[PDB]
Design a protein around this ligand. Structure first.
Ligand SMILES: CC(=O)CC(=O)SCCNC(=O)CCNC(=O)[C@H](O)C(C)(C)COP(=O)(O)OP(=O)(O)OC[C@H]1O[C@@H](n2cnc3c(N)ncnc32)[C@H](O)[C@@H]1OP(=O)(O)O
Ligand SMILES: CC(=O)CC(=O)SCCNC(=O)CCNC(=O)[C@H](O)C(C)(C)COP(=O)(O)OP(=O)(O)OC[C@H]1O[C@@H](n2cnc3c(N)ncnc32)[C@H](O)[C@@H]1OP(=O)(O)O
Ligand SMILES: CC(=O)CC(=O)SCCNC(=O)CCNC(=O)[C@H](O)C(C)(C)COP(=O)(O)OP(=O)(O)OC[C@H]1O[C@@H](n2cnc3c(N)ncnc32)[C@H](O)[C@@H]1OP(=O)(O)O
Ligand SMILES: Cc1cc2nc3c(=O)[nH]c(=O)nc-3n(C[C@H](O)[C@H](O)[C@H](O)COP(=O)(O)OP(=O)(O)OC[C@H]3O[C@@H](n4cnc5c(N)ncnc54)[C@H](O)[C@@H]3O)c2cc1C
Ligand SMILES: Cc1cc2nc3c(=O)[nH]c(=O)nc-3n(C[C@H](O)[C@H](O)[C@H](O)COP(=O)(O)OP(=O)(O)OC[C@H]3O[C@@H](n4cnc5c(N)ncnc54)[C@H](O)[C@@H]3O)c2cc1C
Ligand SMILES: Cc1cc2nc3c(=O)[nH]c(=O)nc-3n(C[C@H](O)[C@H](O)[C@H](O)COP(=O)(O)OP(=O)(O)OC[C@H]3O[C@@H](n4cnc5c(N)ncnc54)[C@H](O)[C@@H]3O)c2cc1C
Ligand SMILES: Cc1cc2nc3c(=O)[nH]c(=O)nc-3n(C[C@H](O)[C@H](O)[C@H](O)COP(=O)(O)OP(=O)(O)OC[C@H]3O[C@@H](n4cnc5c(N)ncnc54)[C@H](O)[C@@H]3O)c2cc1C
Lengths: 415, 415, 415, 415
């Protein structure tokens, strides 16, 4: 309670004149090993298209929305014009991009805002891909064209409160009834669920006692998806607690390609390739910001980029970025050549996100105080990395997928 | 848009039944090296006292205020009843506690909530202490009785946009006028500055060319303090941008004991010990949460505590924590005996600060998904640590303070 | 072949004039937090006495011996004059030191040479202590006084080719025979064993199927112990493969206090406190050496200590040292007060080990090329830490000992 | 003294029968991202030839030689027959391999023995290359053919006691006299120098004040090279202190293409790509050995590979190896494409080197006790990695080479 307590925050141009905030997004200086050499002409055109659009459309508004933990619904039709949704799905009204074209688009979104990327990743590299790989021809033709336009939104429900890392032992049931299925259970952390038109729900078929997948609809009687508050990262992403009580799904809406967790495993493997590319994008952005910031901000009568400790940290981030990118690039190519094991994807995601965590640490301390401000990207990025390091399998779970594959010995279960 | 988009969040007890959230604070398990042995009877009594008060009064409401970036004003008299504000200042209405007493109280506050400790710390171990050291006996008798009971609040303005790490090159001017002084300049990041009744403004005396100190008042004409938004950590702390335009301050509100920057470094050495104790407590709280969570939460039919990977992470935290306490404790003992150099104070704050960053990182990934949720503390703590790692000297600035002392060569300025 | 190939190496004063080799041992600048304040006047006396002797007697010759992987037998009587061997054993011709005194001398020995410390450690803290804690009055008086003078050397044989980390399941058998026992099996890695007078051999008593302990004598029929070659660290220590072929040990030389692994486990805990002081010692040595080296060595027109990067590495070391020391210190008091658990000793030894590794790594790179020369200590110290990080239980085994204790759930056995 | 003290060590098959030592070299499992996909068929063939030669000829003999710190001269005609010496030099009796061809060759040599690698690299990528890039046709035709056959050995002398990192400022002098030059000064750390036939000595022309390069011959009047003893890594490489007192060098032996430091600095960037590949090779070997050791060695009734903690380490190493290779591979393509900058070569060398250090650290602790024995490779490579992390420019110096380039500000010089 003062004369000034109620007053609107001081404008950034007056509050910190020395540096530019992320509204005017930093230029790409993280690309140090000339990555366009590794990209097809079509892939280069997508990279710059996604980037120009994210910097113009999303960067100026992301700070507000991230702070309020609100989703920028108005940005959806643009993201659908970007032709990103539907990744590498061929036909059914999808763009039919290369896995690498999709991967670099993923990074180019994540570079600017990780929530938008997660939004699309969950919608497209999980939601749509599960329909593409596991759906009927009828389902694909019915559901994908619109999903690709972003006229409808998908989400992907696997995780439960009782079942997170231990996904194959999920407890959401699916009971065969007359004319379809009856779904019962509870799902947790499902991004988009609070407004998704389509909800791919993984439920245990109670006849076969194996895991099946079902396309649930928005507003189905017995369905309730509600917002998870107080997240420190991915604040624009709407993560849902879902309740299903005798939610009905007709025969035609069961995914025929999901007959046990082995198929969910096959989806997650391809999905982990796309998730790997999020930390790559984020790291690229953090460096870009850090690079500009350090050159702009002056202390002790010199740019902050003049000091040894600041340079060592800047180059450490820079090396991490080149390696991560190449790491993610190889992964894509392994997939394309049809020779990719789940262990290779797990390691891709585990390793990359670990080095990204490291990179965000350094990038965060490099901006000093402003490094904790959403305004300057890094804080946002630093916070957004944490759940990414957790989802699509934790670091520990992913390294054990690889460890099992590389050694021949499962090491998940307790003594 | 949905029939359930607007609905309130699911109750945590139904949302995630397995683990209990921070609103019911975890028991102390972090204290593995029986630290009460290093505490005197009245030092123990205070540890107990603040602990209970923080768990009962602050824990149940800290989630929602932190999320909304609001200060919990209703909580301030309860903190004033604890008799911790005023620190080690003898007399003048203050508690006259030992340095070690002040330190674990700083830790036990930070254990539950870092924002609250920061508020107290800038108020008591910066605001009140500069009055207690650099003040006249008059300034002591007038402001200190009210500041100790928390009936009035203090802040401490050194940092500004152009001068943060280079505090010595402070730009804010102080022209001499009859009756007193006019303050012209700008400050930034100042904790409590939006509602502080007293604002200790550091400004350059244009007559002597040196930095001085001025107790400016709330609602002084020309003075505007405005909240800094979009912080990722220390969200309840009201850090401000301060505009000073011809701000009048009479002869009696100037601090007679600060005629040079040298005087501010004298104070900053003592504060850097209290600040060193923030990460200690925060890290204790993190281990405390983690210990209980890993025992409650089951995965693959076992508690999360049963897994090698988790036990290692938890044990690394434990070790870190013991070492951090011992480090801070010796830092108090060096102060108590009048042999503490600034380098010693800096090493402590740097080292402890760093190991906390490491501890929080481990703690955060130990909780999986829920580790990003403020409701479970470790997410709050993980974020709160970043600012703490940065302010009162960055890790780098502090290390080069020690570096200069121990090699005789200053390495702050560039080539 | 060359006209200079066979010529002796260049003298250090000529080959590298700028910096002093370890032969003139550096002054103690690692003690930054004034550690004598935590020691009794007796504890201070020993620290000093043990340093004076290590610097004068061992430093000038330790390089030549560490390179040839040889033990300096002539050094033995000088070590037994220090009054170290025996440790905390009360009576029976032992010095009856405090636990902290025995801990400090270990650090001061390890500070100059780690091999020398490991010699004394295996001898006094493992070998002699086993006779104190599990021996009978008869054999305590028979063997201990000679051991404390170092007129005779002891070793401690637990590890086997098949049982290192899994010591509880050892396979060396001890067959009850008229008038004593017959020992059969192999031991690996036993320090001093190639010249030890007393070999404490742990073997499975074939009547009870539990581990027992036996005092075996040098040159006993069926005993042969050979050096382990090609060691990168602790190269002065004579580690042996012991082959035991029907070795006769009479009823009088069976330790009546060892009746299962629980007794040998009781011993390891007290020993791990002393081992924990070794990396403390070594890290002090590395710092002391680096500090002097960065002031003497000059590059780009200034002392290496002038550079931001070097100063930070040095300060990081300095921070670790102070924390490691306090950690070892607190651990001693825990033991002195009868409140030490095995899990507390395991934490000390795990954490301090890990911190030393970090320190040595930093310390090694700081000296550039000379950082890989035994002459300049760091290289020797750096290598020596590696087996210390492994023996007395690996970092992982010790982590899980603490792990099991704090969680109450064992996590050693596989999935 | 003992009846068994002078006996030879126990043969490994009886000492530790559970695991196979490096003398029988492990199969390649570190190639997890199918690296041959990124190599030309010529490059795959070279990779194959070198690997089979190193495993057959060097692995069975390396342990004894590394421990004695002696060079295996008898291996020279084999290494010569591999067709590596000469690297990418086209013509003049050299094999004219591609850049990646020489890179993978480097790695495969280093994979088995780092000393052998450094031997060839200093001879080929420094000695021979300096003549190719900076020699006259007359001296290229005269010296290279025999050098490519290893019938003569070259070395490359830049460093001196007073100039290591600051190489630009060396004090070795070249005075113009009738018929040629007289070289005066001292050199340190020069590999192959005790037996090298040709010695490329860099010395400051006294007329022009710039660094020049001179082909000095073995046993030249005034030349004395002596072995630097007591190294902990690359123990097989013969590094020298070189003494030059009025060493005469004829006009025809002055490299006419070396006129200032920027000529030698241009060579350093090309050879720095090759050095980068040394860590890549070594890490692969470390992984390869670990993989096999962890499957073979049983403890607690399971392979060491069965335990979470061990799998995590193993997978972290594997992640690193993939990233390092891709990193090294990309660097080669940047050079092949003619677009490499010093900063990029510096970044590669710095980053890859640091990752290899982390890897060696993990691989070392994964083998327990035996991880300190040269017999099981890991120990040797761990140690070998330290000089590699230091030479060809340090981590600090290399990072600052990139820092200067990306930021535009040099930060080598002190305040
Ligand atoms: S966004 C949402 C993202 N969510 C996730 O990523 C969830 C993370 N969890 C997972 O990915 C998986 O649950 C997991 C990797 C942790 C384990 O899954 P899984 O072991 O492959 O499936 P599961 O059905 O448990 O496997 C059955 C058996 O196959 C075994 N198996 C052995 N080798 C295997 C191999 N190479 N591949 C697959 N399974 C193998 C498993 O060990 C298990 O045997 P046990 O019953 O004896 O333990
Ligand atoms: S919430 C509060 C947030 N802010 C903080 O905590 C403040 C962090 N900043 C600082 O501590 C300081 O700005 C600082 C340590 C970086 C300033 O350095 P400083 O040297 O101690 O202060 P200053 O008064 O400028 O010293 C003047 C000269 O003393 C020299 N000096 C040498 N030894 C010194 C010593 N032991 N102590 C102080 N100054 C010393 C300095 O080198 C400097 O000369 P140059 O600039 O030519 O090299
Ligand atoms: S220099 C020489 C240095 N050598 C060493 O330090 C040896 C390293 N090894 C060790 O310390 C031990 O062998 C070890 C800790 C790895 C295992 O020993 P241990 O578990 O303490 O005793 P051990 O006899 O194996 O115990 C058998 C049972 O007691 C159980 N136990 C439970 N709590 C226990 C406790 N607090 N203390 C001891 N044992 C406990 C063990 O878990 C084990 O049960 P499981 O059958 O379910 O696995
Ligand atoms: C932002 C966000 C979005 C998400 N979106 C979706 C979504 O769209 N769809 C969906 O289905 N799910 C989603 N999830 C859930 C996500 O997949 C889970 O957070 C994660 O996969 C499971 O972890 P958990 O939260 O259950 O924690 P837990 O599984 O309890 O793990 C806690 C800790 O224990 C460790 N651990 C667990 N098991 C072992 C083991 N066997 N050995 C060693 N260590 C172990 C883990 O590494 C982790 O550190 C989302 C989560 C987040 C945070
Ligand atoms: C939550 C919060 C609360 C705060 N509260 C207060 C307060 O109450 N009172 C107050 O006065 N201030 C306060 N501050 C400001 C804080 O003290 C400053 O952030 C910090 O001391 C100076 O950093 P800066 O933000 O100016 O960034 P900079 O000073 O520009 O530093 C940016 C980076 O450059 C590095 N760097 C700077 N100088 C050098 C150098 N010479 N050599 C090598 N590296 C260098 C730093 O390590 C840092 O990584 C607060 C800040 C935060 C985030
Ligand atoms: C220099 C030196 C001196 C020694 N002196 C003595 C002596 O005097 N007396 C004596 O009795 N012994 C001695 N030893 C033996 C030493 O105590 C053992 O090396 C150690 O206790 C067991 O290691 P190991 O060599 O058998 O390796 P292993 O037990 O094979 O372990 C290999 C790796 O696997 C990991 N690992 C093992 N078990 C598990 C598990 N359950 N879960 C997860 N990870 C696991 C370990 O952490 C380690 O990294 C000495 C060793 C050295 C190196
Ligand atoms: C096995 C081995 C083989 C070698 N072979 C050869 C050879 O064949 N030919 C040859 O010419 N040389 C050779 N060298 C020398 C090698 O290139 C040098 O050791 C290296 O360039 C660094 O020199 P230095 O050892 O004097 O380190 P120093 O220059 O003494 O540096 C010591 C420390 O100070 C730091 N430092 C130095 N300058 C700065 C700065 N400006 N800013 C921040 N930090 C700084 C460094 O990072 C390092 O940690 C060899 C060295 C080794 C170990």
């Amino acid at each position: 309670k003062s004369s000034y307590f109620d007053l609107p925050p001081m404008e950034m141009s007056v509050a910190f004149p020395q540096a530019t905030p992320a509204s005017t997004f930093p230029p790409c200086t993280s690309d140090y090993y000339h990555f366009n050499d590794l990209l097809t002409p079509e892939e280069q055109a997508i990279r710059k298209k996604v980037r120009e659009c994210m910097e113009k459309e999303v960067a100026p508004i992301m700070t507000e929305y991230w702070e309020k933990a609100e989703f920028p619904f108005h940005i959806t039709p643009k993201l659908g014009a970007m032709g990103v949704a539907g990744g590498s799905i061929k036909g059914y009204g999808c763009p039919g991009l290369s896995i690498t074209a999709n991967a670099i688009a993923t990074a180019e979104i994540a570079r600017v805002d990780a929530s938008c990327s997660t939004f699309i990743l969950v919608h497209s590299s999980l939601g749509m891909l599960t329909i593409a790989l596991c759906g009927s021809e009828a389902q694909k033709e019915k559901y994908l064209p619109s999903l690709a336009q972003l006229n409808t939104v998908a989400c992907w429900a696997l995780t439960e409160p009782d079942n997170g890392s231990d996904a194959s032992g999920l407890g959401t049931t699916a009971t065969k009834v007359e004319g379809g299925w009856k779904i019962n259970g509870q799902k947790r952390w499902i991004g988009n669920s609070t407004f998704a038109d389509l909800l791919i729900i993984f439920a245990r078929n109670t006849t076969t006692n194996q895991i099946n997948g079902f396309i649930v609809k928005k507003d189905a009687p017995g369905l309730k998806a509600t917002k998870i508050p107080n997240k420190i990262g991915l604040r624009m992403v709407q993560n849902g607690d879902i309740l299903l009580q005798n939610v009905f799904v007709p025969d035609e809406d069961r995914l025929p390609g999901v007959n046990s967790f082995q198929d969910t495993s096959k989806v997650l493997a391809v999905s982990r390739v796309m998730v790997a590319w999020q930390p790559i994008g984020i790291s690229m952005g953090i460096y870009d910001m850090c690079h500009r910031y350090l050159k702009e901000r002056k202390q002790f009568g010199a740019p902050l980029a003049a000091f040894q400790l600041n340079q060592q940290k800047l180059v450490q981030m820079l090396g991490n970025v080149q390696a991560m990118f190449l790491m993610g690039w190889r992964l894509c190519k392994l997939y394309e050549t049809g020779q990719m094991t789940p262990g290779q994807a797990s390691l891709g995601k585990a390793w990359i996100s670990s080095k990204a965590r490291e990179t965000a640490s350094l990038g965060r301390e490099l901006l000093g105080g402003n490094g904790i401000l959403a305004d300057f990207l890094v804080a946002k990025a630093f916070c957004d990395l944490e759940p990414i390091y957790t989802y699509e399998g934790t670091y520990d779970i992913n390294t054990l997928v690889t460890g099992r594959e590389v050694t021949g010995i499962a090491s998940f279960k307790p003594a």
